[PDB]
Amino acid sequence: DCHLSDMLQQLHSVNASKPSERGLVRQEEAEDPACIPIFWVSKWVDYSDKYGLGYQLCDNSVGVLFNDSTRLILYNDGDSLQYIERDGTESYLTVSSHPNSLMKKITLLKYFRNYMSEHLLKAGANITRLPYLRTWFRTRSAIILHLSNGSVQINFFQDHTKLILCPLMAAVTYIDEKRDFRTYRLSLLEEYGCCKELASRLRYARTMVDKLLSS
Ligand SMILES: BrCc1cccc(I)c1
């Protein structure tokens, strides 16, 4: 299930602790720079009506999850392609070899790429195995992006705040409206507590994860 069940248990545990009602709250003590993620989605474009969901990762790789449930990834060299078939099977190719098979999907990818480069800003830009987008969906309040490495990223439209959950290290990275970035160990938030804002979004995340699991 790509670590979602493990993520749900982590989120329930911290939310069950009611971290915003400790009294003596010390969020900073829950920080850990060893849990900082390597990968997250830095840009995205939703054209699901026609083609699919295009996105850029923080390494500047680009990808598309097409509506036929296939996925094409362009590495940051601008030429190397990874193609993920419906059945999970993966193959590697190049743009320069001009393959008849994927010419249309490559062309589409470049259109996504060009849009993001011209019109979108890169999230997480202020800081330092390539996963692909397994699935995504959006609510009125956010878009939920589940990567093949188990990470779940949640972008809230209203305030441009973001969550990146990593179940492997039982950690959450929180990006606030000031574009400020902090990574926390979930078990420690349980102990030292946190602000109402972070707590509310972890509750929202629990629910979004259940949705992913319900599909
Ligand atoms: Br039909 C041009 C096109 C195709 C895919 C994505 C985008 I943004 C634009």
PDB file of C-alpha atoms and ligand atoms in Angstrom:
ATOM      1  CA  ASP A   1       0.000   0.000   0.000  1.00  0.00           C
ATOM      2  CA  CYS A   2       3.079   2.241  -0.294  1.00  0.00           C
ATOM      3  CA  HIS A   3       3.432   3.023   3.442  1.00  0.00           C
ATOM      4  CA  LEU A   4       0.007   4.661   3.789  1.00  0.00           C
ATOM      5  CA  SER A   5      -1.162   2.371   6.593  1.00  0.00           C
ATOM      6  CA  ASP A   6       2.017   3.170   8.514  1.00  0.00           C
ATOM      7  CA  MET A   7       1.402   6.864   7.872  1.00  0.00           C
ATOM      8  CA  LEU A   8      -2.159   6.581   9.173  1.00  0.00           C
ATOM      9  CA  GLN A   9      -0.973   4.993  12.427  1.00  0.00           C
ATOM     10  CA  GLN A  10       1.649   7.694  12.923  1.00  0.00           C
ATOM     11  CA  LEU A  11      -0.883  10.470  12.333  1.00  0.00           C
ATOM     12  CA  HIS A  12      -3.523   8.980  14.599  1.00  0.00           C
ATOM     13  CA  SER A  13      -1.006   8.589  17.418  1.00  0.00           C
ATOM     14  CA  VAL A  14       0.078  12.249  17.310  1.00  0.00           C
ATOM     15  CA  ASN A  15      -3.474  13.512  16.828  1.00  0.00           C
ATOM     16  CA  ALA A  16      -4.700  11.284  19.681  1.00  0.00           C
ATOM     17  CA  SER A  17      -2.139  12.995  21.904  1.00  0.00           C
ATOM     18  CA  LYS A  18      -3.744  16.422  21.319  1.00  0.00           C
ATOM     19  CA  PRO A  19      -0.344  18.137  20.847  1.00  0.00           C
ATOM     20  CA  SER A  20      -1.866  21.642  20.844  1.00  0.00           C
ATOM     21  CA  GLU A  21      -3.114  21.322  24.435  1.00  0.00           C
ATOM     22  CA  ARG A  22       0.117  20.483  26.297  1.00  0.00           C
ATOM     23  CA  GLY A  23       0.225  23.761  28.182  1.00  0.00           C
ATOM     24  CA  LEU A  24       4.022  23.854  28.124  1.00  0.00           C
ATOM     25  CA  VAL A  25       4.560  23.742  24.365  1.00  0.00           C
ATOM     26  CA  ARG A  26       8.066  23.511  22.893  1.00  0.00           C
ATOM     27  CA  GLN A  27       7.728  22.779  19.183  1.00  0.00           C
ATOM     28  CA  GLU A  28      11.380  23.543  18.446  1.00  0.00           C
ATOM     29  CA  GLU A  29      12.448  20.523  20.514  1.00  0.00           C
ATOM     30  CA  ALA A  30      10.607  18.269  18.068  1.00  0.00           C
ATOM     31  CA  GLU A  31      12.814  19.430  15.177  1.00  0.00           C
ATOM     32  CA  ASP A  32      15.260  17.080  13.503  1.00  0.00           C
ATOM     33  CA  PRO A  33      17.384  17.901  10.416  1.00  0.00           C
ATOM     34  CA  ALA A  34      18.135  14.196   9.890  1.00  0.00           C
ATOM     35  CA  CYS A  35      14.572  13.720   8.666  1.00  0.00           C
ATOM     36  CA  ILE A  36      14.710  16.414   6.012  1.00  0.00           C
ATOM     37  CA  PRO A  37      13.259  14.982   2.789  1.00  0.00           C
ATOM     38  CA  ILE A  38      15.257  14.552  -0.410  1.00  0.00           C
ATOM     39  CA  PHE A  39      12.248  14.790  -2.706  1.00  0.00           C
ATOM     40  CA  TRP A  40       9.051  16.805  -2.877  1.00  0.00           C
ATOM     41  CA  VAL A  41       6.791  18.287  -5.535  1.00  0.00           C
ATOM     42  CA  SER A  42       7.910  21.821  -6.313  1.00  0.00           C
ATOM     43  CA  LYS A  43       5.385  22.662  -9.047  1.00  0.00           C
ATOM     44  CA  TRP A  44       2.248  21.123 -10.500  1.00  0.00           C
ATOM     45  CA  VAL A  45      -0.298  21.673 -13.267  1.00  0.00           C
ATOM     46  CA  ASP A  46      -3.745  20.081 -13.374  1.00  0.00           C
ATOM     47  CA  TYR A  47      -5.046  19.359 -16.878  1.00  0.00           C
ATOM     48  CA  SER A  48      -6.940  16.203 -15.931  1.00  0.00           C
ATOM     49  CA  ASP A  49      -9.900  17.161 -18.143  1.00  0.00           C
ATOM     50  CA  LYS A  50      -7.802  16.291 -21.185  1.00  0.00           C
ATOM     51  CA  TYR A  51      -4.334  14.911 -20.554  1.00  0.00           C
ATOM     52  CA  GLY A  52      -3.313  14.521 -16.942  1.00  0.00           C
ATOM     53  CA  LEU A  53      -1.400  15.965 -14.018  1.00  0.00           C
ATOM     54  CA  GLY A  54       2.041  17.462 -14.757  1.00  0.00           C
ATOM     55  CA  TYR A  55       4.557  18.128 -11.987  1.00  0.00           C
ATOM     56  CA  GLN A  56       8.165  19.051 -11.225  1.00  0.00           C
ATOM     57  CA  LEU A  57      10.219  17.559  -8.401  1.00  0.00           C
ATOM     58  CA  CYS A  58      12.707  19.581  -6.320  1.00  0.00           C
ATOM     59  CA  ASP A  59      15.586  18.011  -8.309  1.00  0.00           C
ATOM     60  CA  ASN A  60      14.094  19.707 -11.398  1.00  0.00           C
ATOM     61  CA  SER A  61      12.967  16.401 -12.863  1.00  0.00           C
ATOM     62  CA  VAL A  62       9.549  16.623 -14.483  1.00  0.00           C
ATOM     63  CA  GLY A  63       6.788  14.048 -14.727  1.00  0.00           C
ATOM     64  CA  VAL A  64       3.268  13.475 -15.906  1.00  0.00           C
ATOM     65  CA  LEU A  65       0.608  11.155 -14.579  1.00  0.00           C
ATOM     66  CA  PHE A  66      -1.705  10.654 -17.565  1.00  0.00           C
ATOM     67  CA  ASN A  67      -5.390   9.779 -17.205  1.00  0.00           C
ATOM     68  CA  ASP A  68      -4.679   6.333 -18.685  1.00  0.00           C
ATOM     69  CA  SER A  69      -2.743   5.839 -15.434  1.00  0.00           C
ATOM     70  CA  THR A  70       0.644   5.677 -17.171  1.00  0.00           C
ATOM     71  CA  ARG A  71       3.507   7.933 -16.146  1.00  0.00           C
ATOM     72  CA  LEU A  72       6.385   9.573 -17.989  1.00  0.00           C
ATOM     73  CA  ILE A  73       9.377  11.084 -16.208  1.00  0.00           C
ATOM     74  CA  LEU A  74      12.014  13.368 -17.727  1.00  0.00           C
ATOM     75  CA  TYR A  75      15.191  13.430 -15.627  1.00  0.00           C
ATOM     76  CA  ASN A  76      16.985  16.728 -14.989  1.00  0.00           C
ATOM     77  CA  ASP A  77      19.423  16.063 -17.873  1.00  0.00           C
ATOM     78  CA  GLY A  78      16.613  16.918 -20.279  1.00  0.00           C
ATOM     79  CA  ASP A  79      16.943  13.669 -22.257  1.00  0.00           C
ATOM     80  CA  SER A  80      16.622  10.515 -20.111  1.00  0.00           C
ATOM     81  CA  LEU A  81      13.074   9.187 -19.801  1.00  0.00           C
ATOM     82  CA  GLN A  82      11.514   6.714 -17.423  1.00  0.00           C
ATOM     83  CA  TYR A  83       8.163   5.306 -18.526  1.00  0.00           C
ATOM     84  CA  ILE A  84       5.874   3.602 -16.009  1.00  0.00           C
ATOM     85  CA  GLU A  85       3.285   1.311 -17.578  1.00  0.00           C
ATOM     86  CA  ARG A  86      -0.205   0.706 -16.196  1.00  0.00           C
ATOM     87  CA  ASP A  87       0.952  -2.611 -14.760  1.00  0.00           C
ATOM     88  CA  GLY A  88       3.704  -0.952 -12.694  1.00  0.00           C
ATOM     89  CA  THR A  89       6.409  -2.129 -15.109  1.00  0.00           C
ATOM     90  CA  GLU A  90       9.139   0.410 -15.875  1.00  0.00           C
ATOM     91  CA  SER A  91      11.302   1.108 -18.924  1.00  0.00           C
ATOM     92  CA  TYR A  92      14.000   3.632 -19.756  1.00  0.00           C
ATOM     93  CA  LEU A  93      14.484   5.591 -22.945  1.00  0.00           C
ATOM     94  CA  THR A  94      15.699   8.874 -24.404  1.00  0.00           C
ATOM     95  CA  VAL A  95      14.036  11.804 -26.099  1.00  0.00           C
ATOM     96  CA  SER A  96      16.903  11.956 -28.589  1.00  0.00           C
ATOM     97  CA  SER A  97      16.173   8.429 -29.830  1.00  0.00           C
ATOM     98  CA  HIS A  98      12.832   9.866 -31.016  1.00  0.00           C
ATOM     99  CA  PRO A  99      10.722   6.770 -30.251  1.00  0.00           C
ATOM    100  CA  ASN A 100       7.532   6.525 -32.306  1.00  0.00           C
ATOM    101  CA  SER A 101       5.798   4.867 -29.372  1.00  0.00           C
ATOM    102  CA  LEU A 102       5.892   7.773 -26.923  1.00  0.00           C
ATOM    103  CA  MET A 103       6.226  10.764 -29.243  1.00  0.00           C
ATOM    104  CA  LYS A 104       2.819  12.149 -28.311  1.00  0.00           C
ATOM    105  CA  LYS A 105       3.330  11.704 -24.561  1.00  0.00           C
ATOM    106  CA  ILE A 106       6.790  13.242 -24.718  1.00  0.00           C
ATOM    107  CA  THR A 107       5.409  16.215 -26.624  1.00  0.00           C
ATOM    108  CA  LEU A 108       2.734  16.606 -23.949  1.00  0.00           C
ATOM    109  CA  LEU A 109       5.352  16.413 -21.206  1.00  0.00           C
ATOM    110  CA  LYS A 110       7.360  19.221 -22.782  1.00  0.00           C
ATOM    111  CA  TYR A 111       4.217  21.363 -22.897  1.00  0.00           C
ATOM    112  CA  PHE A 112       3.781  20.782 -19.168  1.00  0.00           C
ATOM    113  CA  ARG A 113       7.467  21.462 -18.610  1.00  0.00           C
ATOM    114  CA  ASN A 114       7.393  24.758 -20.516  1.00  0.00           C
ATOM    115  CA  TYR A 115       4.305  25.960 -18.657  1.00  0.00           C
ATOM    116  CA  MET A 116       5.836  25.348 -15.244  1.00  0.00           C
ATOM    117  CA  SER A 117       9.107  27.043 -16.206  1.00  0.00           C
ATOM    118  CA  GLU A 118       7.402  30.218 -17.445  1.00  0.00           C
ATOM    119  CA  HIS A 119       4.459  30.641 -15.083  1.00  0.00           C
ATOM    120  CA  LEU A 120       5.145  28.821 -11.834  1.00  0.00           C
ATOM    121  CA  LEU A 121       7.410  29.371  -8.869  1.00  0.00           C
ATOM    122  CA  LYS A 122       9.378  26.559  -7.341  1.00  0.00           C
ATOM    123  CA  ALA A 123       8.222  25.514  -3.859  1.00  0.00           C
ATOM    124  CA  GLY A 124      10.847  24.680  -1.232  1.00  0.00           C
ATOM    125  CA  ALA A 125      13.342  26.613  -3.352  1.00  0.00           C
ATOM    126  CA  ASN A 126      14.948  28.214  -0.310  1.00  0.00           C
ATOM    127  CA  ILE A 127      16.639  25.022   0.894  1.00  0.00           C
ATOM    128  CA  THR A 128      18.793  21.988   0.129  1.00  0.00           C
ATOM    129  CA  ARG A 129      15.762   6.515  -6.228  1.00  0.00           C
ATOM    130  CA  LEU A 130      13.693   9.049  -8.171  1.00  0.00           C
ATOM    131  CA  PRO A 131      10.047   8.577  -7.155  1.00  0.00           C
ATOM    132  CA  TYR A 132       7.019   9.174  -9.376  1.00  0.00           C
ATOM    133  CA  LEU A 133       3.504  10.333  -8.610  1.00  0.00           C
ATOM    134  CA  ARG A 134       1.431   7.288  -7.678  1.00  0.00           C
ATOM    135  CA  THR A 135      -1.833   9.161  -7.320  1.00  0.00           C
ATOM    136  CA  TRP A 136      -3.288  12.527  -6.445  1.00  0.00           C
ATOM    137  CA  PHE A 137      -6.614  14.238  -5.855  1.00  0.00           C
ATOM    138  CA  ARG A 138      -7.770  17.669  -4.826  1.00  0.00           C
ATOM    139  CA  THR A 139     -10.237  19.110  -2.373  1.00  0.00           C
ATOM    140  CA  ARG A 140     -11.533  22.678  -2.248  1.00  0.00           C
ATOM    141  CA  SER A 141      -8.816  23.406   0.316  1.00  0.00           C
ATOM    142  CA  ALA A 142      -5.765  21.504  -0.949  1.00  0.00           C
ATOM    143  CA  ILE A 143      -4.166  19.077  -3.349  1.00  0.00           C
ATOM    144  CA  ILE A 144      -2.875  15.729  -2.128  1.00  0.00           C
ATOM    145  CA  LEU A 145       0.102  14.129  -3.837  1.00  0.00           C
ATOM    146  CA  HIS A 146       1.252  10.622  -3.028  1.00  0.00           C
ATOM    147  CA  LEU A 147       4.745   9.719  -4.255  1.00  0.00           C
ATOM    148  CA  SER A 148       6.003   6.206  -4.984  1.00  0.00           C
ATOM    149  CA  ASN A 149       8.523   6.463  -2.142  1.00  0.00           C
ATOM    150  CA  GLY A 150       5.677   6.615   0.382  1.00  0.00           C
ATOM    151  CA  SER A 151       5.793  10.368   0.853  1.00  0.00           C
ATOM    152  CA  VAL A 152       2.510  12.231   0.956  1.00  0.00           C
ATOM    153  CA  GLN A 153       2.565  15.920   0.171  1.00  0.00           C
ATOM    154  CA  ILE A 154      -0.315  18.236   0.908  1.00  0.00           C
ATOM    155  CA  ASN A 155      -0.499  21.733  -0.517  1.00  0.00           C
ATOM    156  CA  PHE A 156      -3.085  24.086   0.984  1.00  0.00           C
ATOM    157  CA  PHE A 157      -4.360  26.646  -1.517  1.00  0.00           C
ATOM    158  CA  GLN A 158      -5.489  29.372   0.880  1.00  0.00           C
ATOM    159  CA  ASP A 159      -2.200  30.190   2.635  1.00  0.00           C
ATOM    160  CA  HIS A 160       0.298  28.314   0.432  1.00  0.00           C
ATOM    161  CA  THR A 161       1.243  26.167   3.439  1.00  0.00           C
ATOM    162  CA  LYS A 162       2.496  22.665   2.722  1.00  0.00           C
ATOM    163  CA  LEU A 163       3.033  19.323   4.423  1.00  0.00           C
ATOM    164  CA  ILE A 164       5.424  16.610   3.369  1.00  0.00           C
ATOM    165  CA  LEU A 165       4.912  13.397   5.327  1.00  0.00           C
ATOM    166  CA  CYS A 166       7.548  10.683   5.413  1.00  0.00           C
ATOM    167  CA  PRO A 167       6.433   7.435   7.114  1.00  0.00           C
ATOM    168  CA  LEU A 168       9.891   5.840   6.868  1.00  0.00           C
ATOM    169  CA  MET A 169      11.276   8.305   9.412  1.00  0.00           C
ATOM    170  CA  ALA A 170       7.872   8.992  10.980  1.00  0.00           C
ATOM    171  CA  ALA A 171       8.432  12.679  10.213  1.00  0.00           C
ATOM    172  CA  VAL A 172       6.573  15.689   8.842  1.00  0.00           C
ATOM    173  CA  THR A 173       8.012  18.718   7.080  1.00  0.00           C
ATOM    174  CA  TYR A 174       5.981  21.899   7.396  1.00  0.00           C
ATOM    175  CA  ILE A 175       6.281  24.895   5.103  1.00  0.00           C
ATOM    176  CA  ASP A 176       4.497  28.001   6.404  1.00  0.00           C
ATOM    177  CA  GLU A 177       3.141  31.129   4.677  1.00  0.00           C
ATOM    178  CA  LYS A 178       6.495  32.868   5.192  1.00  0.00           C
ATOM    179  CA  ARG A 179       8.026  30.115   3.075  1.00  0.00           C
ATOM    180  CA  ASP A 180       9.781  29.009   6.249  1.00  0.00           C
ATOM    181  CA  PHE A 181      10.657  25.342   6.454  1.00  0.00           C
ATOM    182  CA  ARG A 182      10.834  23.064   9.527  1.00  0.00           C
ATOM    183  CA  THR A 183      11.090  19.272   9.828  1.00  0.00           C
ATOM    184  CA  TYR A 184       9.686  17.449  12.853  1.00  0.00           C
ATOM    185  CA  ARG A 185       9.677  13.960  14.276  1.00  0.00           C
ATOM    186  CA  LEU A 186       6.028  13.012  14.889  1.00  0.00           C
ATOM    187  CA  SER A 187       6.718  11.134  18.122  1.00  0.00           C
ATOM    188  CA  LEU A 188       8.295  14.289  19.538  1.00  0.00           C
ATOM    189  CA  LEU A 189       5.405  16.553  18.568  1.00  0.00           C
ATOM    190  CA  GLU A 190       3.379  14.143  20.655  1.00  0.00           C
ATOM    191  CA  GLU A 191       5.742  14.857  23.569  1.00  0.00           C
ATOM    192  CA  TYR A 192       6.597  18.555  23.237  1.00  0.00           C
ATOM    193  CA  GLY A 193       3.353  19.574  21.522  1.00  0.00           C
ATOM    194  CA  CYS A 194       2.701  22.089  18.733  1.00  0.00           C
ATOM    195  CA  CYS A 195       0.689  25.149  17.666  1.00  0.00           C
ATOM    196  CA  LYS A 196      -3.010  24.927  16.790  1.00  0.00           C
ATOM    197  CA  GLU A 197      -2.169  25.521  13.112  1.00  0.00           C
ATOM    198  CA  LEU A 198       0.135  22.539  12.660  1.00  0.00           C
ATOM    199  CA  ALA A 199      -2.211  20.383  14.714  1.00  0.00           C
ATOM    200  CA  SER A 200      -5.222  21.211  12.545  1.00  0.00           C
ATOM    201  CA  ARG A 201      -3.343  20.325   9.362  1.00  0.00           C
ATOM    202  CA  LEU A 202      -2.133  16.997  10.775  1.00  0.00           C
ATOM    203  CA  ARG A 203      -5.798  16.222  11.502  1.00  0.00           C
ATOM    204  CA  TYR A 204      -6.657  17.136   7.920  1.00  0.00           C
ATOM    205  CA  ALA A 205      -3.780  14.950   6.735  1.00  0.00           C
ATOM    206  CA  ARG A 206      -5.074  11.930   8.685  1.00  0.00           C
ATOM    207  CA  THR A 207      -8.368  12.301   6.818  1.00  0.00           C
ATOM    208  CA  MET A 208      -6.669  12.764   3.415  1.00  0.00           C
ATOM    209  CA  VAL A 209      -4.631   9.611   4.005  1.00  0.00           C
ATOM    210  CA  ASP A 210      -7.798   7.653   4.804  1.00  0.00           C
ATOM    211  CA  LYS A 211      -9.186   8.851   1.465  1.00  0.00           C
ATOM    212  CA  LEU A 212      -6.081   7.578  -0.337  1.00  0.00           C
ATOM    213  CA  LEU A 213      -6.494   4.259   1.471  1.00  0.00           C
ATOM    214  CA  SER A 214     -10.155   4.180   0.434  1.00  0.00           C
ATOM    215  CA  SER A 215      -8.859   3.969  -3.149  1.00  0.00           C
TER     216      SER A 215
HETATM  217 BR1  LIG B   1      -2.521  21.057 -26.121  1.00  0.00          BR
HETATM  218  C1  LIG B   1      -1.068  21.877 -25.134  1.00  0.00           C
HETATM  219  C2  LIG B   1      -0.804  21.368 -23.759  1.00  0.00           C
HETATM  220  C3  LIG B   1      -0.762  20.000 -23.541  1.00  0.00           C
HETATM  221  C4  LIG B   1      -0.523  19.505 -22.269  1.00  0.00           C
HETATM  222  C5  LIG B   1      -0.324  20.375 -21.212  1.00  0.00           C
HETATM  223  C6  LIG B   1      -0.366  21.739 -21.430  1.00  0.00           C
HETATM  224  I1  LIG B   1      -0.056  23.031 -19.799  1.00  0.00           I
HETATM  225  C7  LIG B   1      -0.606  22.244 -22.700  1.00  0.00           C
END
